[PDB]
Prior knowledge:
- By secondary structure, the chain is an alpha+beta fold.
- It has helices spanning 50-62, 94-100, 117-129, and strands spanning 4-14, 17-22, 25-31, 34-35, 67-71, 83-89, 92-93, 105-106.
- The chain has 3 helices and 8 strands.
- Helix 2 runs parallel beside helix 3 (117-129).
- Residues 116-136 are annotated as: Disordered.
Amino acid sequence: KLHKEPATLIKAIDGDTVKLMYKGQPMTFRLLLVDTPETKHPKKGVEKYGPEASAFTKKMVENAKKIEVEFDKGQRTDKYGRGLAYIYADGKMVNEALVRQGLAKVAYVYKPNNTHEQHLRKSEAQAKKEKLNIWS
Ligand SMILES: Cc1cn([C@H]2C[C@H](OP(=O)(O)O)[C@@H](COP(=O)(O)O)O2)c(=O)[nH]c1=O
Ligand SMILES: [Ca+2]
């Protein structure tokens, strides 16, 4: 039932937040089902692998020919007004790429926005057994 829609990059903000032009309007998107280490919040400080996660997402979306957004089957925005989506760069899901590299954990799993949960958890398990980055 999920469908991909085109969007255009405005700016990568950090590892799991990107600003896109979607249907003619600028919008902040927060990646579904993942959490990258913080780089901004004073309470957290700059967490280890935060800069690495931000650089990974930035490189992936800036070099892409085509960006697409895929909403899940529940709420499409969070309480901060951010879009909640799976984001694809040239057909590759950014959310999964981060988890597979050990630069994000699977997190914030809120039903019914969990269609790709199993897929992402399998990638997380592989990153853990390979002891990559956050799992090292
Ligand atoms: C990924 C995601 C985050 N959020 C909210 C939960 C957290 O709220 P609180 O700020 O109150 O803790 C926050 C985590 O986002 P960030 O990781 O960007 O900080 O965004 C959702 O409500 N739904 C979601 O699907
Ligand atoms: Ca985060």
